[PDB]
Amino acid sequence: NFNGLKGTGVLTESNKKFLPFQQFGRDIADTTDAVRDPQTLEILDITPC
Amino acid sequence: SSSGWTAGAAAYYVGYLQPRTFLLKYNENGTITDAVDCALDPLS
Numbered sequence A: 001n002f003n004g005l006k007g008t009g010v011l012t013e014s015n016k017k018f019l020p021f022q023q024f025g026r027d028i029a030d031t032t033d034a035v036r037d038p039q040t041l042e043i044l045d046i047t048p049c
Numbered sequence B: 001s002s003s004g005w006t007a008g009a010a011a012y013y014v015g016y017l018q019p020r021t022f023l024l025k026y027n028e029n030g031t032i033t034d035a036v037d038c039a040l041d042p043l044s
């Protein structure tokens, strides 16, 4: 429930760099892939298992 | 002083914005590298 992003998946570790204002990653299908954890700042790739 | 002032060179340029459709080509990172306008050319 990361801030209003309901869904089911596996929160792995990724290696992409975010700009200071960009928060939500996306793709062609407009489904969120990369979300930055609200309390600690890092990258968590979202993949359905 | 006021009657004749010597200062360094400077320049400021002003343009004007008009509504258009753009294409943006994102890099492997989040930086925007190229942009293409549509109302410029037949090839565009």
Ligand SMILES: *[C@@H]1O[C@H](CO)[C@@H](O[C@@H]2O[C@H](CO)[C@@H](O)[C@H](O)[C@H]2NC(C)=O)[C@H](O)[C@H]1NC(C)=O
Pocket: A017, B027, B028, B029
């Ligand atoms: C995208 O970002 C990556 C790193 O986040 C850049 O990769 C590094 O770029 C510097 C500067 O050119 C090099 O000194 C490093 O050797 C690069 N690292 C690797 C592992 O290759 C990359 O240049 C950026 N741009 C693109 C188009 O990928």
